[PDB]
Each structure stands twice: as structure tokens, then as C-alpha cells.
Design a protein around this nucleic acid. Structure first.
Lengths: 120, 115, 120, 115
DNA sequence: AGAGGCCGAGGCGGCCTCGGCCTC
DNA sequence: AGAGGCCGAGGCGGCCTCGGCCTC
């Protein structure tokens, strides 16, 4: 199981671990099964402005924007409760557009997203 | 099983909404978990006395602690060493009366911390 | 300068130092000068339901109830900013009635309070 | 005084709203504070070079740091070692030009980290 | 150059439950 | 006895600024 996001996405993500800064864009790397579940659970839990689910090297990535700010640790705590026994990596996203755009182009692809035609 | 053997129930605290702490407890669980918990409870709660008993193809642990505890705390500890197996944890109001009953049929002593 | 409240009041006070519990009753031990100032500043800052100022062995004690809960550390942080260079001890009060009543009887006395006739 | 000597002002950054960092600074303060800060700044910021100068009955410190800093950070450090005395901290845009001017009259070198 | 968007470390100040204490 | 008020430790999850980074 992956220990981090794909190398090609790392420059868009926050790697902060000692910060209480809150933000409004997040990504989760997990199994197809757990990402499908979390897609709807995260959408509802955080009233997301946008969420998309993507293929990533036989796993899935969720990408989402929230209407209010959250600590990465909070999003992680939520997601980890619903993913006992499967891998899950949750990070804040700094370069939001670059991350989403990377996620729509090979080797990744969109599985589903909450707004028709995605973001621009 | 969803409760203790029906003939032990009057020895036990039947509290639901109490924050009362006590220093005698009983656990009803599987043979595997009772063997494991006998040792774990002894160390965790520095028990003054612990006994393990046979009870209708399951086991009962009976124990006295040197300090008082909530039933819910003992249960919280025991339950996270039992995430799959069955387990009922109850406080014991009638202490000697519970141990004595657990020493006579249908119950039998498997082991005790004091001979 | 005192290092704690008078011994006779200690059983009414919280001595917690490792807790983030919030409460709604506090006391401050400080100089006459700083207690007079804080009486009005605390009243306003926290919208107190009640505040009283008391003589205590040639210093003053402030006693107050707040309409919302606060960490002792928060009340302390506020009070300490306005008492650079003079002693100030700030504690939560557990036994609110017993504390206030003790504070109205010798060797303590009321200097001023925010409601006529005090509390009962 | 409320600013640097009026003839040094074109050597200095005149930023107010910038988060730009730099690696040359100047401090205008009292003789007592300049003697103290010369040593404190040297150690705190591991300065590559620091000079202390006379300026109209006060002193100027001039320093280069190995890493970049906000003027406000340098000021925050210097100000809390000066809670009573006057102190103006500014970044220096024209580095050699500032040091050279501070070596010629009306200014005089009291001391430099390099001869 | 100066204005200013960004972001990791980390202080601050609420919320909450656990697991004891107590009295009625 | 059981119900339940109380309270210290301490996890949680926002807010904020400092003091760097960057580009326009």
C-alpha cells in the first residue's frame, strides 16, 4: 500500500505536520471501496462546495473544497474512523487548481464529480 | 449470552445511570478471552485477588482491586482487548457471596491468585 | 507578595493546572490599584453576571461570575497583560457560594459589587 | 529621534506594507543599547559582519546576516531588549553605500567585526 | 522596491468525554 | 443501591500572528 500520494502530486500538497493552520481544500488517497463511500460521507459531513473522485494507480483519490476551514488533522480523524483496516492518506492541498488539473489528466482520471463539467 | 448466569444476578450491581465506583468486578466472556484477561486485568488494575471460573461453557473472572473503579472503565479496558468476542462486565455488590457461589456447582474454579 | 490565595479560601478554589475544562466563576488576588482597574475592565471584557471586589490582608480579591465559560488560562492571560510589574494570582472557583460568602465575612470585606445587596 | 539621520535615508528600504525579506539592516539607538545590541544581534543572527558607529550623540549598528529576515522580525527582537530606550530599525537597500557613508564624517566607526 | 499572496510553526481558548470524587 | 452533580486530565478542532517563502 502507498505510503504517500503519487510523486507527481506531492508539490501541490501541504506536507505540514506541526501546524494548526486550517484550510479549505483536501485530498484523500485510499482504496476504491473506501473512496466511493467517503465521496458521499465527506460531501455531506462538510457540505463541500465541490468533491471529485479519481483513479490513481489502482486506488482512488478524493479531492474536495469545503465552505469553511478545517485542520487537516480533523479531516483525517473523520476519514480514519471510516477506514479501519484499509490504507488512507489525507493531506491539505496548497496548489488547488494544479492538483485538480493534474487529477483530470493521465495517469489519473475522473470517476465522478459533484458538478457537471468539473472546475476551471 | 447477553447477561450473567441468571442465578448470579443478585450478587451484582444493577446500576445503569450511576457514577458510583467500586472495587469488585466480574467479567463473563469466552475461555480464550478469560485466560487472556485474567493476566491483563491482574497487571492493569494491580488486583489484590483474581479468580477464573467455569460457567456453562464460558468463563467468569472475579476480581478485587486495591482502588475503586467505574464499571464502565473496567468495561472500556476489557472491551478493547475483545473487539470480536462476547463480553459482559458488571460490578459486584455481594462480594464473598459471589465468589462462594462461583466455587460451588454449576461453577468451578479454574485458577485463583491466592490458593 | 502572596504566592497563592489566603489559606482559608483554598478549599473553594480549583487548583487544576493540566485541565482545559472551562468554567464560569473566577477569583483574582492582586493589589488594590490593579483590582480597582480590573473590576471595571473584567466587568466589560466578559460581560459579567456579577463582580465584587474585596479587601484581603492589605491586597484585594476580585470575585466574578461570567455568562459564558472560559479557561482559567484565558482569564489569567487577560488579567496578566494589565498587571505587568504587580503580583496577580488568578484561579477558577469551584465552590462559588462558599467562596463569595467567605469573602463577605472577616477577615475579608466587600469594597464594591455590581449588584446591590450582593448574592444569596 | 524618530528617523535615521536625514542623509542616510536613501540607503534604506522605505517599505511599509512589504513582506520582503533582506540580509542587511541598520539600527539607530542609544549608546548603551547599541553596545548591548552589537553583541546580541551578532549572536542571535549569526551575523557575517556587524559595525557600530557614532551618529549625532547616538549610535548606529550596521549588519549583514547569512540568511534573509523581515525588518519587522529584526525590530521585534531588538525592541524587546529595549523596552524603555529609543530604537529605529530599518532594512538597508544600498549596502556598501551605507557602510561607506557611516565610515565618513559626521559618522565614525566605534567597532567592526572585521578590522 | 514595495505591495502583497502564501504557508508552516505554533500560541490561544473554546468544546467535549473519561474516570474518578462526592452526596442524596 | 442507584441516580446523578462535580471536576481534573487531557483529546479535539477552530481562531490567530510571526516570520519566512514567493511573484507582480
Amino acid at each position: 500500500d502507498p505510503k504517500d500520494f503519487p510523486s507527481e502530486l506531492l508539490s501541490f500538497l501541504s506536507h505540514a505536520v506541526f501546524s494548526n493552520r486550517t484550510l479549505a481544500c483536501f485530498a484523500i488517497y485510499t482504496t476504491k471501496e473506501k473512496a466511493a463511500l467517503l465521496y458521499k460521507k465527506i460531501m455531506e459531513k462538510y457540505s463541500v462546495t465541490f468533491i471529485s473522485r479519481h483513479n490513481s494507480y489502482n486506488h482512488n483519490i478524493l479531492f474536495f473544497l469545503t465552505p469553511h476551514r478545517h485542520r487537516v488533522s480533523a479531516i483525517n480523524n473523520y476519514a480514519q474512523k471510516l477506514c479501519t483496516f484499509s490504507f488512507l492518506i489525507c493531506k491539505g492541498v496548497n496548489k488547488e487548481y494544479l492538483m485538480y488539473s493534474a487529477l483530470t489528466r493521465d495517469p489519473f482520471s475522473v470517476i465522478e464529480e459533484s458538478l457537471p463539467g468539473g472546475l476551471k
